[PDB]
Ligand binder design. Sequence first.
Ligand SMILES: [Mg+2]
Ligand SMILES: [Mg+2]
Ligand SMILES: [Mg+2]
Ligand SMILES: [Mg+2]
Ligand SMILES: [Mg+2]
Ligand SMILES: [Mg+2]
Ligand SMILES: [Mg+2]
Ligand SMILES: [Mg+2]
Ligand SMILES: [Mg+2]
Ligand SMILES: [Mg+2]
Ligand SMILES: [Mg+2]
Ligand SMILES: [Mg+2]
Ligand SMILES: [Mg+2]
Ligand SMILES: [Mg+2]
Ligand SMILES: [Mg+2]
Ligand SMILES: [Mg+2]
Ligand SMILES: [Mg+2]
Ligand SMILES: [Mg+2]
Ligand SMILES: [Mg+2]
Ligand SMILES: [Mg+2]
Ligand SMILES: [Mg+2]
Ligand SMILES: [Mg+2]
Ligand SMILES: [Mg+2]
Ligand SMILES: [Mg+2]
Ligand SMILES: [Mg+2]
Ligand SMILES: [Mg+2]
Ligand SMILES: [Mg+2]
Ligand SMILES: [Mg+2]
Ligand SMILES: [Mg+2]
Ligand SMILES: [Mg+2]
Ligand SMILES: [Mg+2]
Ligand SMILES: [Mg+2]
Ligand SMILES: [Mg+2]
Ligand SMILES: [Mg+2]
Ligand SMILES: [Mg+2]
Ligand SMILES: [Mg+2]
Ligand SMILES: [Mg+2]
Ligand SMILES: [Mg+2]
Ligand SMILES: [Mg+2]
Ligand SMILES: [Mg+2]
Ligand SMILES: [Mg+2]
Ligand SMILES: [Mg+2]
Ligand SMILES: [Mg+2]
Ligand SMILES: [Mg+2]
Ligand SMILES: [Mg+2]
Ligand SMILES: [Mg+2]
Ligand SMILES: [Mg+2]
Ligand SMILES: [Mg+2]
Ligand SMILES: [Mg+2]
Ligand SMILES: [Mg+2]
Ligand SMILES: [Mg+2]
Ligand SMILES: [Mg+2]
Ligand SMILES: [Mg+2]
Ligand SMILES: [Mg+2]
Ligand SMILES: [Mg+2]
Ligand SMILES: [Mg+2]
Ligand SMILES: [Mg+2]
Ligand SMILES: [Mg+2]
Ligand SMILES: [Mg+2]
Ligand SMILES: [Mg+2]
Ligand SMILES: [Mg+2]
Ligand SMILES: [Mg+2]
Ligand SMILES: [Mg+2]
Ligand SMILES: [Mg+2]
Ligand SMILES: [Mg+2]
Lengths: 65, 84, 54
Amino acid sequence: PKMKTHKMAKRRIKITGTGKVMAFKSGKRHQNTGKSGDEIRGKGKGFVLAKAEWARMKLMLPRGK
Amino acid sequence: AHKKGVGSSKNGRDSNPKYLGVKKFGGEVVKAGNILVRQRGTKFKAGQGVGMGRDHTLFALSDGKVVFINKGKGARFISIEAAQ
Amino acid sequence: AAAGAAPRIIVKMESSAGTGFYYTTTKNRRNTQAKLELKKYDPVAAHVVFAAAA
RNA sequence: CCUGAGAAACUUGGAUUUCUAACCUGAAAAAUCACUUUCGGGGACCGUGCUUGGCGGGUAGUUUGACUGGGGCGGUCGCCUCCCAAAAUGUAACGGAGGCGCCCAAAGGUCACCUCAAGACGGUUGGAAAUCGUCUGUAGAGCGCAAAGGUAGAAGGUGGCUUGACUGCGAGACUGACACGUCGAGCAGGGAGGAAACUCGGGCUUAGUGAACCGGUGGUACCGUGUGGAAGGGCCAUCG
RNA sequence: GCGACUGUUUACCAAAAUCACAGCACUCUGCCAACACGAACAGUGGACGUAUAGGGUGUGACGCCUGCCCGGUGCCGGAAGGUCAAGUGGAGCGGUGCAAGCUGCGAAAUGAAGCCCCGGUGAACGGCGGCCGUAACUAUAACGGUCCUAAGGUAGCGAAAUUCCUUGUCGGGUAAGUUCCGACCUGCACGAAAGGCGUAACGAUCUGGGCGCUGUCUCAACGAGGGACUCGGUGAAAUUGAAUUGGCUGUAAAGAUGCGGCCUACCCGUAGCAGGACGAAAAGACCCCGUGGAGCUUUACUAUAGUCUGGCAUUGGGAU
RNA sequence: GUAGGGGAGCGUUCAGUCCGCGGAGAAGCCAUACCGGAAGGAGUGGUGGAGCCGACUGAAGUGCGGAUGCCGGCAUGAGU
RNA sequence: AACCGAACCUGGAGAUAGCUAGUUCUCCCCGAAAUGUAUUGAGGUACAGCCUCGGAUGUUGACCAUGUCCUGUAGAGCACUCACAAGGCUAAAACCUUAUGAAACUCCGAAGGGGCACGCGUUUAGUCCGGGAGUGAGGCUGCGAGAGCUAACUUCCGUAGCCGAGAGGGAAACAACCCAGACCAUCAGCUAAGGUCCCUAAAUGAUCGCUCAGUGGUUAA
RNA sequence: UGUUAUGGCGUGCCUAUUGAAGCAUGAGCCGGCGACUUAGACCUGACGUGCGAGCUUAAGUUGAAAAACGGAGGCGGAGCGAAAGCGAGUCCGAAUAGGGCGGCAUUAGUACGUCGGGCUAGACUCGAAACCAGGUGAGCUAAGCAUGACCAGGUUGAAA
RNA sequence: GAAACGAUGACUGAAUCCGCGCGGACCACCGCGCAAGGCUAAAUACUCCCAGUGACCGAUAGCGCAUAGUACCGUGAGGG
RNA sequence: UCAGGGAACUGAAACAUCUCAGUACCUGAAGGAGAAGAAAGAGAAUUCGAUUCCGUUAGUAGCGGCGAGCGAACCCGGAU
Ligand SMILES: [Mg+2]
Ligand SMILES: [Mg+2]
Ligand SMILES: [Mg+2]
Ligand SMILES: [Mg+2]
Ligand SMILES: [Mg+2]
Ligand SMILES: [Mg+2]
Ligand SMILES: [Mg+2]
Ligand SMILES: [Mg+2]
Ligand SMILES: [Mg+2]
Ligand SMILES: [Mg+2]
Ligand SMILES: [Mg+2]
Ligand SMILES: [Mg+2]
Ligand SMILES: [Mg+2]
Ligand SMILES: [Mg+2]
Ligand SMILES: [Mg+2]
Ligand SMILES: [Mg+2]
Ligand SMILES: [Mg+2]
Ligand SMILES: [Mg+2]
Ligand SMILES: [Mg+2]
Ligand SMILES: [Mg+2]
Ligand SMILES: [Mg+2]
Ligand SMILES: [Mg+2]
Ligand SMILES: [Mg+2]
Ligand SMILES: [Mg+2]
Ligand SMILES: [Mg+2]
Ligand SMILES: [Mg+2]
Ligand SMILES: [Mg+2]
Ligand SMILES: [Mg+2]
Ligand SMILES: [Mg+2]
Ligand SMILES: [Mg+2]
Ligand SMILES: [Mg+2]
Ligand SMILES: [Mg+2]
Ligand SMILES: [Mg+2]
Ligand SMILES: [Mg+2]
Ligand SMILES: [Mg+2]
Ligand SMILES: [Mg+2]
Ligand SMILES: [Mg+2]
Ligand SMILES: [Mg+2]
Ligand SMILES: [Mg+2]
Ligand SMILES: [Mg+2]
Ligand SMILES: [Mg+2]
Ligand SMILES: [Mg+2]
Ligand SMILES: [Mg+2]
Ligand SMILES: [Mg+2]
Ligand SMILES: [Mg+2]
Ligand SMILES: [Mg+2]
Ligand SMILES: [Mg+2]
Ligand SMILES: [Mg+2]
Ligand SMILES: [Mg+2]
Ligand SMILES: [Mg+2]
Ligand SMILES: [Mg+2]
Ligand SMILES: [Mg+2]
Ligand SMILES: [Mg+2]
Ligand SMILES: [Mg+2]
Ligand SMILES: [Mg+2]
Ligand SMILES: [Mg+2]
Ligand SMILES: [Mg+2]
Ligand SMILES: [Mg+2]
Ligand SMILES: [Mg+2]
Ligand SMILES: [Mg+2]
Ligand SMILES: [Mg+2]
Ligand SMILES: [Mg+2]
Ligand SMILES: [Mg+2]
Ligand SMILES: [Mg+2]
Ligand SMILES: [Mg+2]
């Protein structure tokens, strides 16, 4: 059986050139009028997971994409 | 024979810890923007080279070496003096 | 937050510039009574003042 | 060619009434049937078929949290402050007390100006307390709300102008297992107050919060299944 | 005391006060009846019956009787109005192509049953209750009775198969009576077809008392028979870590033949006893736990047989 | 030194190859004071009556005291 | 059809089983955890924390001294807050002398602790990259607290040590206490705690006293 | 070597546990059967081997007491972005300041094998109570329908 | 789902060549197609049976059987 | 093999859509095979040309309480 790709992880995770794993910062959908404008700015973004969380994601998409 | 309660506590409660106090002590090197005190009030006043966020957080402005000024109790200052 | 909201309401401050851009904050209706009139930056030009759209 | 109507007709319907060849149903030499007719009765209803909405423990699949000096009852479940907490941080208990799920268009930005509680002497209503004056007066006050720290060279009280309660970012740290969370110099656009040095990306600070998912709304023109469009998605914003 | 009665029931712990019963009431049902079994427009039960019949429900001979409350719920009935689905009707909005046109969404008005709403309905589901004040230390046996939801107990009954306080209080019987009987009423928490209070008779029912008689007992004897014992014949079982398996006191996971100290004890068996070997048997059935199970209940969620209902089809003509 | 990680090995069947034994007697069974650091391994003798050891290499249905484990035989209780 | 709150047979079917049992050959090396937060989670699981193997570094680790900064406990103290003992004084409050309690009082405030630099001086660890885990029930004693009755072989935290996973001597016996960490062989020597009348290895030792009660060999006003 | 007398010393094994000689679990005894495996052309490491800026085939074809062919495909070769697209650059942005990346002060992959582990499958072995499907049962028992059988003797003494 | 296309149960129902059907709502354009009429070997699946082979088993193994669906159990299905 | 009918346990660490799975089972018809078949097609090159089967594309495109998990086709290479 070919190991399947974890379709949830498709739109939320990114493989990197070196071989680290990325995602988008969170809290941006109704936690808005908070705000602060620098939070709202800092959140829409993107960023690298701390580390412990790497193996799993890697196993989520074997193809990298 | 037995009992049926009924009392409880109204207490228990407390709040998650607020890791406060000084993080950078007397005679310590410092990168730009390294934090040196978390505090509730004006416990430690900024001296030369150190600014102060709204948390009354003291953070150093231009690298250097940390120095503590205790000006006789209740009026105290932290500063940076660069080496040389 | 929650529905009932009698004092303070999330109002949106939409531009006169006709750009598309808007803001959001809160007004008490006890003291604004009529409308809200504010002067903030527009990032589709530079600095053009908005009014309290619904 | 007609506004509005009068005859005629096609009517296409709606309701009623009624007839019968559909259909249903009983009787007679042929028991369930088929005949045939006297038929007799009913009748385009009932029945049946597809769809529409209601009722439907008759049946059917399942749901019915945890903590807990056994379980149940009561209490509790997130957040903030103090004590416990052993002078770094941290640290449990159904240990000991108390607040929050907001509020403020000024209670914010800046600029400028003002200094409190209380007692003592003397003072028209008063006469415990009101309002005035003199003397003392480092906080014995105030800070929208809890308490802790903080603060009189102001954060405290007052006024002028105001929308920085701003976009594009983020050197560097605090802090958490992660996700979060917190502080933040400095660069750009572009503004506010100031004569100016300058300060301002909310509120003295620490609670006033909800990850994803699916969806509403304003912008955007990234993808759009032969091509060009449009449905639909995507992006930034944002509401539940 | 309970049930009227004969009857009936849990094969294998309950025979009863359970069920059934004759009688009574409510209600549905006009006959292709209601109702029920069915792939079903088949067929069948009902019933080759016809409202003095048939189904469903409750009560339970007989006698005297069977009160108050229709607010909630359910049933029967009402209808001005508010109602509500498909559909009928598309004013009006967009897409595309140069366009005729094709096409995306779609508002009024109309539109069934049903709910809201009005009334009725108890031998329909049911309801017929909260309470006021006491000398002292944050308090125990005892109290007399006014009364909120639609109403707030008519009879009869009451310390009861119903009574918490409880051995209520008085009387009875007894030498002595927490039980039984009668009366009382302060019914924690009776009450009228979930029937109320009686009732002759019936009962392997339950409860108390008496007479008689008795080894039930004081208190046990003697006897018999069948085992048990002995010999010859045939010869199981559950159990079993292995055993060379004492007593006291102590220690150990807190109940010791096995550990410590001290004491006792020559080796083997037969008949006997049941204190121990936490003796045997059943991976405790109480209890908790498992995001185990299953039966059952509902105004928990969801669907659904069935069923009511509008439109389309079978489905046609006419007259107003 | 418990869970666990790591390292070097022992033994079992089958397989390829090499060596080679065997009616002057194989495997299996039985006794034993010898050998090796351990799994284990040889010597001799008794049994048996036709197959088999050692070495290197390969592949496994590969190593037991437990599971109220499974099949089987035989004990105890009892001459009860 | 000898066990019916849904018969029996076969099949789906090796249903699922966060649960209980069970898990087999040898030697050598290192060697845990029972903590944190999150969980329809509490005897389960994720990530950290701790173990091991490998590759990288190259003293970065460890202890201890010196220097420097941080702290609000022990005590103490009454200057505020709350509480409180006798008196003065006054119309009671304030105030005066005398006097005292405090987790949530503080004019003060140690010992100690924590950060940073050196290594001025000893010693061995560390950190990172990757493979494999297991553990997430802890237990006692001392000291520090709460809860509790200044009860518990009690409960919940902090801290050291041991058991857990630790054999050996001692404490009669005895996970934990005291001494002490077992590579193997020895009919060899010294010691630790604890002991030297006999059971029982070792002075019926020495000297100055005490108690005469079997105190010794378990409690108090 | 066997066997013994006497002295010293000594709390079965396993499991489960904070803690087992435990009066906690399992077990009569011995003999045999009895539990971490297989698969994929999956994923990811360690070891080894062959090629090496390249490496490799699968189905299949032919041959077959052997193996050879077979380049379809797959892996490296460039990243960055939501994507268009841009490209040692790229994305946010109006540019800056940043993230990811290339260079870097260097770095080799690929196919196979053995092993460690992951995934999916019964996935270490044994064990439910249950759930569903199709069938077998009324020779027991609960009842119905049709058809036969049976109730010594005695007492009581209703209507008419 | 923005739901094309096929497929029918109900209702309804067009063009036949300048015509018809598709190309993932929908329109134009550009492409592919001739529904409502039928048969068709070959490559593929399986293995009761037959033959050859085996790092498959040799009497608790291997089929349940060195043979037996027998004895035996069950009313029976069925087990064995 | 095709066709009419069509489960649940289980997985989602609870469950209802979902999944198990058009699997088990039931019925039907038939053969040594059967099914399928001669484009109102696939598709995007104005390319290919009956069907079935193998490899591959490819766990890609997509599906999905966008959870668990489910999962093509075209091209290209073969068999015929
Ligand atoms: Mg139910
Ligand atoms: Mg609980
Ligand atoms: Mg509760
Ligand atoms: Mg401390
Ligand atoms: Mg803790
Ligand atoms: Mg979801
Ligand atoms: Mg939009
Ligand atoms: Mg759009
Ligand atoms: Mg009776
Ligand atoms: Mg009788
Ligand atoms: Mg019985
Ligand atoms: Mg009986
Ligand atoms: Mg109506
Ligand atoms: Mg009396
Ligand atoms: Mg009485
Ligand atoms: Mg009665
Ligand atoms: Mg005899
Ligand atoms: Mg003896
Ligand atoms: Mg004791
Ligand atoms: Mg003894
Ligand atoms: Mg012994
Ligand atoms: Mg006896
Ligand atoms: Mg049990
Ligand atoms: Mg229906
Ligand atoms: Mg060792
Ligand atoms: Mg060989
Ligand atoms: Mg052999
Ligand atoms: Mg055994
Ligand atoms: Mg047994
Ligand atoms: Mg046996
Ligand atoms: Mg005898
Ligand atoms: Mg005996
Ligand atoms: Mg005998
Ligand atoms: Mg039975
Ligand atoms: Mg099983
Ligand atoms: Mg299955
Ligand atoms: Mg060691
Ligand atoms: Mg881990
Ligand atoms: Mg060092
Ligand atoms: Mg003190
Ligand atoms: Mg002083
Ligand atoms: Mg846990
Ligand atoms: Mg724990
Ligand atoms: Mg602990
Ligand atoms: Mg304890
Ligand atoms: Mg020890
Ligand atoms: Mg010891
Ligand atoms: Mg000893
Ligand atoms: Mg002990
Ligand atoms: Mg000594
Ligand atoms: Mg001696
Ligand atoms: Mg225990
Ligand atoms: Mg343990
Ligand atoms: Mg024992
Ligand atoms: Mg035992
Ligand atoms: Mg147990
Ligand atoms: Mg036993
Ligand atoms: Mg390699
Ligand atoms: Mg490999
Ligand atoms: Mg495994
Ligand atoms: Mg169609
Ligand atoms: Mg044999
Ligand atoms: Mg289920
Ligand atoms: Mg599930
Ligand atoms: Mg046939």
